[PDB]
Design an enzyme around this catalytic site. Sequence first.
Site, PDB file in Angstrom:
ATOM      1  N   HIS A   1       0.826  -1.211   0.000  1.00  0.00           N
ATOM      2  CA  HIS A   1       0.000   0.000   0.000  1.00  0.00           C
ATOM      3  C   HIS A   1       0.862   1.264   0.000  1.00  0.00           C
ATOM      4  CE1 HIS A   1      -3.827  -2.201   0.772  1.00  0.00           C
ATOM      5  NE2 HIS A   1      -3.020  -3.039   1.395  1.00  0.00           N
TER       6      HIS A   1
ATOM      7  N   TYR B   1       2.551  -4.796  12.170  1.00  0.00           N
ATOM      8  CA  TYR B   1       2.500  -3.366  11.866  1.00  0.00           C
ATOM      9  C   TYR B   1       3.456  -2.530  12.711  1.00  0.00           C
ATOM     10  CZ  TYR B   1      -1.427  -4.073   8.675  1.00  0.00           C
ATOM     11  OH  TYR B   1      -2.214  -4.470   7.620  1.00  0.00           O
TER      12      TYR B   1
HETATM   13  C1  HEM Z   1      -0.938 -11.769   7.369  1.00  0.00           C
HETATM   14  C2  HEM Z   1      -1.622 -10.738   6.862  1.00  0.00           C
HETATM   15  C3  HEM Z   1      -1.069  -9.302   6.658  1.00  0.00           C
HETATM   16  C4  HEM Z   1       0.135  -8.783   6.961  1.00  0.00           C
HETATM   17  C5  HEM Z   1       1.343  -9.483   7.625  1.00  0.00           C
HETATM   18  C6  HEM Z   1       0.140  -7.389   6.559  1.00  0.00           C
HETATM   19  C7  HEM Z   1       1.183  -6.495   6.692  1.00  0.00           C
HETATM   20  C8  HEM Z   1       1.151  -5.144   6.403  1.00  0.00           C
HETATM   21  C9  HEM Z   1       2.263  -4.223   6.484  1.00  0.00           C
HETATM   22  C10 HEM Z   1       3.705  -4.577   6.902  1.00  0.00           C
HETATM   23  C11 HEM Z   1       1.834  -3.011   6.128  1.00  0.00           C
HETATM   24  C12 HEM Z   1       2.703  -1.736   6.082  1.00  0.00           C
HETATM   25  C13 HEM Z   1       2.453  -0.935   7.354  1.00  0.00           C
HETATM   26  C14 HEM Z   1       3.482   0.151   7.512  1.00  0.00           C
HETATM   27  O1  HEM Z   1       4.572   0.043   6.900  1.00  0.00           O
HETATM   28  O2  HEM Z   1       3.215   1.122   8.261  1.00  0.00           O
HETATM   29  C15 HEM Z   1       0.423  -3.103   5.811  1.00  0.00           C
HETATM   30  C16 HEM Z   1      -0.399  -2.069   5.401  1.00  0.00           C
HETATM   31  C17 HEM Z   1      -1.752  -2.159   5.141  1.00  0.00           C
HETATM   32  N1  HEM Z   1      -2.512  -3.308   5.238  1.00  0.00           N
HETATM   33 FE1  HEM Z   1      -1.850  -5.183   5.774  1.00  0.00          FE
HETATM   34  N2  HEM Z   1      -1.091  -7.102   6.011  1.00  0.00           N
HETATM   35  C18 HEM Z   1      -1.855  -8.250   6.050  1.00  0.00           C
HETATM   36  C19 HEM Z   1      -3.152  -8.356   5.593  1.00  0.00           C
HETATM   37  C20 HEM Z   1      -4.026  -7.300   5.457  1.00  0.00           C
HETATM   38  C21 HEM Z   1      -5.468  -7.351   5.569  1.00  0.00           C
HETATM   39  C22 HEM Z   1      -6.252  -8.651   5.861  1.00  0.00           C
HETATM   40  C23 HEM Z   1      -5.943  -6.108   5.366  1.00  0.00           C
HETATM   41  C24 HEM Z   1      -7.397  -5.573   5.380  1.00  0.00           C
HETATM   42  C25 HEM Z   1      -8.470  -6.270   5.760  1.00  0.00           C
HETATM   43  C26 HEM Z   1      -4.811  -5.239   5.128  1.00  0.00           C
HETATM   44  C27 HEM Z   1      -4.871  -3.883   4.882  1.00  0.00           C
HETATM   45  C28 HEM Z   1      -3.816  -3.000   4.902  1.00  0.00           C
HETATM   46  C29 HEM Z   1      -3.867  -1.590   4.584  1.00  0.00           C
HETATM   47  C30 HEM Z   1      -5.119  -0.796   4.155  1.00  0.00           C
HETATM   48  C31 HEM Z   1      -2.640  -1.087   4.732  1.00  0.00           C
HETATM   49  C32 HEM Z   1      -2.253   0.386   4.484  1.00  0.00           C
HETATM   50  C33 HEM Z   1      -2.166   1.146   5.801  1.00  0.00           C
HETATM   51  C34 HEM Z   1      -1.750   2.563   5.520  1.00  0.00           C
HETATM   52  O3  HEM Z   1      -2.200   3.135   4.497  1.00  0.00           O
HETATM   53  O4  HEM Z   1      -0.954   3.121   6.312  1.00  0.00           O
HETATM   54  N3  HEM Z   1      -3.662  -5.996   5.193  1.00  0.00           N
HETATM   55  N4  HEM Z   1       0.047  -4.421   5.991  1.00  0.00           N
END
Ligand code: HEM
EC number: 1.11.-.-
Lengths: 420, 420
Positions: A24, A314
């Site tokens: 993202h 996160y």
């Molecule tokens: C094992 C499953 C998941 C892992 C390990 C994961 C991991 C991550 C990581 C590392 C980030 C970056 C955060 C940062 O650098 O500050 C992120 C961002 C994000 N994730 Fe996940 N994710 C997973 C599944 C999901 C799911 C299921 C959703 C929604 C239902 C999702 C929605 C998002 C969104 C919208 C962002 C963007 C947040 C922002 O704009 O700051 N992800 N995720």
Amino acid sequence: ENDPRLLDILSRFNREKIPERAVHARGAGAYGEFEVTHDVSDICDIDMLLGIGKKTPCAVRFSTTALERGSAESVRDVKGMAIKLFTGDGEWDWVCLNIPMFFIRDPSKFPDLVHAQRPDPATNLANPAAWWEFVCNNHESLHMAVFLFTDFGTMFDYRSMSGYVSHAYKWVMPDGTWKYVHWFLASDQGPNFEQGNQTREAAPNDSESATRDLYQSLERGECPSWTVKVQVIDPEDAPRLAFNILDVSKHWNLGNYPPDIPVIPERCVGKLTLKKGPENYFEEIEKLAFSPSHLVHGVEPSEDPMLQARLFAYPDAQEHRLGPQFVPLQKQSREHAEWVSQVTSSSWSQPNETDYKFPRELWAALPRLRGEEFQNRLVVNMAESVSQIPEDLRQKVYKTLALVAEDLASRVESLTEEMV
Amino acid sequence: ENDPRLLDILSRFNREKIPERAVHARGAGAYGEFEVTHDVSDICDIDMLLGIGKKTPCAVRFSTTALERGSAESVRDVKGMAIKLFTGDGEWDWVCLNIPMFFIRDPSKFPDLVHAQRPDPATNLANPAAWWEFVCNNHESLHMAVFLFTDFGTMFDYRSMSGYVSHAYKWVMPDGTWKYVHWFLASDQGPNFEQGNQTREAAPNDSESATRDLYQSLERGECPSWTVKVQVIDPEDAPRLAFNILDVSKHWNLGNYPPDIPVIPERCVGKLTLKKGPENYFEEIEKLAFSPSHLVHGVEPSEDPMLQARLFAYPDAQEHRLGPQFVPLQKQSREHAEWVSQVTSSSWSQPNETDYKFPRELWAALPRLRGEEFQNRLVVNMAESVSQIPEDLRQKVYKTLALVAEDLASRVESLTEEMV
Ligand code: HEM
Ligand code: HEM
Ligand SMILES: C=C(C)/C=C/c1cccc2[nH]cc(C[C@H](NC)C(=O)O)c12
Ligand SMILES: C=C(C)/C=C/c1cccc2[nH]cc(C[C@H](NC)C(=O)O)c12
């Protein structure tokens, strides 16, 4: 060089960029407020949700998922919506996707999935072969695959999209009783499953069409709004359902598909309205930190393993990216205990019949609720993607699609072989 | 979560990304070799340039300049070509642009210029207003401005572009005598100033058209080549020239413009041929470190202040980006001393007559060597850009353009007023 003033200016300019988000990375932001419109005091004890007419400030970030910072926003991808709410009890985060299903069920497979959607590790170009290999190796993604190659894959900008937390959470009353909950935000200026399509086509060479759309709508005086709704399940009724609500790859039926699974009704909670844009994009939007672990009194996580992994991931990712380096719950029955222990077994990472049942019923529902042209466009998009991969992988994809449905596989194969 | 294996996997995945380059963030890479074709033993003592038929391995990175990692490569921008040569005396770096002129000659203005080409700091959208304010405040960029809004602004991919070091360097003989030198690489499959235009239009929604072009050309067996040439000036003849060769915003006339400045002829040195692409893009291309301070025996920097600043800036930027954080010269005459001391005076950062003479003669040369349609397209592009800025800035731009040529300013003003 040599001049201390010039050295200071250049050194300060050099340390201005930070690593982008692992996923993202491309997105935009806005500020607004949430207002309560309905009474939910019988199922909830969260201060933010009690009292009709109560207002809470919030900050929202919209994003795509797979590509880099400067990539196009009108690509075939899932979209993200992160909401930070500043309540009297602290910060509450809703980190949502534009669809209530996800690719996988086992968190240990998450990095591989991400690598399957990034550019080619050798050429830095688009590579469908990795994605199709992952799909053929992980059948629980098939459902999401069927969603991604329909029109819904390329239909939404930041204003017309919806948001779903996609996990089961727990809402707890002061007496110790609790319920499984899932809430989502329905767009007031966007389509739904039954009706509606894209109405504003992006420019041929515009990489920031969605950001421009949101910014212009905010500057025109229009305020986008969302309606917040929640679905509630009793803990003693979860083990008897026809599907697992702790499986993030499945959705909770609202009345579309599968027909044999009964509907779980939703109820309204409030409304979210966006008001203004940022003054400094890098300081306000780029450095925003979201986490599903940001919780307030009255809401708890469930036993979802993906959610449990997200609780840790996160803050650690934010430590790398933004770091200096640059009420007791009542006990349930034994049957509930076995149903919960189902998620820690070795068979959790193996496909079951539901993994094929859900995409098959979505494929069957597409012509009943949208029309024949919708199904045809899905077939055309899938063939366009598949015709770029070597022949053995093509045969593997055909076999997997046949596992989903025979006519879908036959049509995709027939149309794909004519394009190579 | 709670599994050490899962925690290790997720933590390792969370640390894969590093900050991108401050400039030239988007690019591609290749490997090839350089071969000597002509004898230059009378002006040079560099080991890799002596001996006809001698081969030296090299690694090349092509890039754009202004936008982010995932941005489109077919934008109106200047392009970069960085060559690392692995010689017996160490590593020699040629860090070149696709044009022999630059925007400025005062290094302390470099960050501001960069900020004038980045997206809007509040909306993250394209902002022509910042660029035109800089041009109206820094007249020495006018030359480059006239170049950028011709067809040459959008004409080149990675194969058809040329490369120029753009600075004066010093080549030193073992007896202590030295000469001012400037070398460049002319494309063997690209256009020149007099003849040639674009022959491969990019796809409407392709952000990696140049990378795909280079990769496909390498896979087909075609090997791109460049011819290396050098221009030589005696130190005692530099103070008497009609222009300052220590001013990086000017070019050395090869026979096009300005007509009243005599030609400085070039001589051939060798040839550079690209052979193969990388195996791991991130490890081989993304983490490549280039610096103008990477020099071998026999070549020295000159008194160019921009070059002196670049000698310090690149290692410091690489320390931030890739760090753990994630023969005596002959004395010249007194007149040469005064001419050199000219670059440290307070008037170095103020415009002179040459700053207006160069773009005026380029504008006059365009119809004589390319036709009327080239000039008309330049006017149309300028009007399209200027018609998106506020009226007072528009009048300022018209006044600034009037200092180059009255007809150019009048035509641009008429077209821009019709466009708004
Ligand atoms: C094992 C499953 C998941 C892992 C390990 C994961 C991991 C991550 C990581 C590392 C980030 C970056 C955060 C940062 O650098 O500050 C992120 C961002 C994000 N994730 Fe996940 N994710 C997973 C599944 C999901 C799911 C299921 C959703 C929604 C239902 C999702 C929605 C998002 C969104 C919208 C962002 C963007 C947040 C922002 O704009 O700051 N992800 N995720
Ligand atoms: C005051 C003037 C300049 C300053 C302070 C400056 C600074 C920088 C910096 C900080 C980088 C990023 C390096 C890294 O992060 O590893 C860079 C890259 C680059 N610069 Fe400059 N620059 C200047 C002018 C120029 C000029 C005059 C040229 C060419 C004639 C040029 C060509 C390039 C190229 C091609 C790259 C990309 C190198 C690569 O691909 O690794 N720049 N510059
Ligand atoms: C909301 C849009 C435009 C598409 C949703 C959608 C599309 C395809 C498959 C889907 N499965 C589930 C949904 C969302 C679901 N549709 C009743 C809801 O609105 O809660 C969905
Ligand atoms: C090489 C191309 C296609 C355009 C070069 C170009 C274009 C506009 C202004 C220019 N000023 C100087 C050059 C380069 C110069 N032309 C004799 C050379 O080949 O050394 C140039």
